[PDB]
Design a protein around this ligand. Structure first.
Ligand SMILES: OC[C@H]1O[C@@H](O)[C@H](O)[C@@H](O)[C@@H]1O
Ligand SMILES: OC[C@H]1O[C@@H](O)[C@H](O)[C@@H](O)[C@@H]1O
Lengths: 391, 391
């Protein structure tokens, strides 16, 4: 239940920042900096920094963290570095990480070890398909990894108008306490919210009320780190979600909308454990699985990279998630009879019309609306503005 | 710990055999039959048969078996089937497995699930390199897997003159008991034994005696399931090991020589867990790691597929191996100062000369002998007969 943040104390920051100007420095990428944000805020509690070699091995082979207890940790959080930089910095026991001209953190007692890229991609993604857009970034990175104790100077801000939504796990716990929450149920997502998603979240709220929880709180938690090129961008998704809440499709008085700062791997059942354990750190006792969670189509062939039931099955078997209950995904679809979203029943297959993201883009392209009741009208209007902005 | 064998009771065999002639049958390969042998003898205790879907997933993602407790199980033991055979047998709750005209086992309450071959190879081997000889067998197998409860009619014999060495875990425990063993230390291997290997085993015996064990027993345990084309064949290796024992380089009075019936995957750190946990089932309290354990050169390039320290590091971190102590590998080499083998010390680098398997084959090719003290003379003569037999 403890959260291990990695920030310098407030009262020491001005002095610490002043001194770090003298240390040798290592330039990191934007993706690396998003991982520094993830580490800094305690999402990967109790990691002390970028993973050392033994931590990396245990994650890759067992999906658990080096610890006297059992802690779920299924994805590597590692910092790739060039051979040149390894040569320069090995044996330096205290150096700075910098990005965009700013010194953002100090890495202490660093160790350098081989980045065996093909093995990492095979074991984490279950493929080494070079066209996968996140695998491509790993394959292009340096041949070494550096792990160590990380101390982060201050909260990583992006200054894009969305930092107000980038809450830390501690801040989310404080917000839930202010709402007198006695159940926190989380929904991970990377797409617009339609009324089938909403139906799932409303069904979960209803089920928790019937169990006797007095104040269940929905944590609507869109991912906002690196995503692939064909996802709707984060700022447009936040506008769309805001429209859903303003329409009352989800109730603002029992919902927290916040951005989860992690890069997305699109690693299917390996990554859904990460999506779950991070919401657990933020206090969620309940986790709603999505459709094809963390999945994507195999490039070139367009067939599903992962088997669509494996995320839920693996999450149900995973070690170190004892404090969270998995809420199964339930297919919803537009019911032509009720003119409304409803849970799908194969015993009534012919009543239901499915609407995918490609369908929505094609609908906007012809200036069409989806069926009435598929999406809150102001939220649909946000999406048509997005597609229009693509000209 | 209990061993869960899968054999039909003695008193029932003649009856069950007579009945199984009427059941629908599924033809399995030689490799499959070697896995039936592994399963039947309890090496994969407490597996009940070929892995069901949820067992398979937990193995691939977590290296542990579906459990009430935590049990190490890092490799899939699965039965591939063609789509035609799946169509024929799904819903059949009791059918036989057959090979070479013999009905060898009954599979009960079978379930069929997709063989996602690329994902299996990526997660288990950390590569999908097609040319890896065991990966090629997986890639060429059927598109379905079948799991279920397996009942094996009788001990799988190969009738090649080596069945006397293929002892079950129960038989190994009984043999150790007959020797009044109070420590059993196991050495996995797939190659000839030279006097560096022997030095490691003799040093381990010495250390166990100094800890106060009165009767430590060496389990010299060559693997004898499927191996790749360029390994010395099993019958030649057993002749070579017998020569080492007859020369007294290892003491027959405190050594058990037996054949471990598992196919070899050559999957490095994933497979060394399997090599260790199987010896644990047979009662080994101590497990000596070899050099580059379960490794092989990447085909085409010929560099090491795995990082040579990872097998020992991963084994030290693995869950479910609490009752085994890992004895670290120590490099030995031919010391030119004296002439015996000796543990390598970089501080005396120039005294030592290494002798690989390629070096031994080239030595035989020119009719040359290795240095005096590298290998027992009778055992070297076995190897020169082997190399000569390939003309
Ligand atoms: O998810 C945050 C951002 O990540 C970038 O990698 C994507 O290209 C953007 O569209 C997205 O808004
Ligand atoms: O290890 C048992 C046998 O397996 C076969 O696959 C190899 O080709 C033989 O050389 C070996 O003796």
């Amino acid at each position: 239940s403890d959260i291990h943040e990695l920030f310098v104390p407030e009262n020491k920051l001005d002095h610490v920042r002043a001194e770090a100007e003298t240390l040798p420095s290592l330039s990191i990428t934007k993706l690396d900096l998003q991982w520094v944000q993830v580490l800094s805020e305690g999402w990967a509690t109790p990691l002390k920094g970028f993973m050392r070699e033994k931590e990396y091995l245990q994650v890759m082979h067992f999906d658990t963290l080096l610890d006297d207890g059992v802690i779920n940790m299924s994805i590597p959080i590692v910092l790739p570095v060039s051979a040149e930089d390894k040569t320069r910095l090995e044996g330096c026991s205290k150096f700075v990480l910098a990005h965009g001209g700013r010194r953002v953190a100090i890495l202490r007692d660093a160790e350098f070890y081989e980045h065996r890229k093909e093995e990492r991609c095979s074991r984490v993604w279950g493929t080494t398909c070079t066209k996968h857009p996140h695998i491509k970034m790993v394959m292009e990175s340096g041949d070494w990894l550096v792990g160590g104790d990380l101390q982060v100077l201050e909260k990583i801000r992006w200054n894009d108008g969305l930092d107000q939504y980038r809450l830390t796990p501690l801040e989310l716990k404080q917000k839930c306490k202010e709402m007198n929450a006695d159940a926190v149920f989380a929904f991970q997502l990377r797409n617009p919210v339609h009324n089938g998603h909403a139906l799932l979240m409303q069904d979960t709220r209803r089920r928790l009320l019937e169990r006797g929880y007095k104040h269940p709180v929905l944590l609507l938690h869109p991912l906002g780190g690196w995503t692939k090129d064909d996802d709707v961008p984060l700022d447009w998704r936040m506008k769309q979600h805001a429209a859903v809440l303003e329409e009352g499709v989800l109730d603002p008085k029992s919902t927290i909308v916040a951005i989860f700062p992690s890069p997305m791997l699109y690693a299917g059942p390996t990554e859904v454990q990460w999506h779950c354990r991070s919401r657990m750190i933020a206090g969620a006792n309940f986790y709603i699985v999505g459709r094809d969670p963390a999945g994507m189509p195999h490039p070139e062939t367009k067939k599903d990279l992962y088997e669509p039931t494996h995320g839920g099955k693996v999450l149900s078997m995973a070690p170190g998630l004892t404090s969270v209950e998995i809420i199964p995904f339930r297919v919803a679809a537009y019911n032509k009879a009720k003119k409304a979203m409803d849970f799908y029943d194969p015993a009534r297959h012919n009543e239901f019309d499915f609407i995918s993201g490609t369908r929505m883009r094609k609908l906007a392209r012809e200036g069409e609306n989806p069926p009435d009741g598929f999406m809150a009208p102001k939220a649909w209007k946000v999406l048509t503005d997005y597609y229009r902005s693509l000209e």
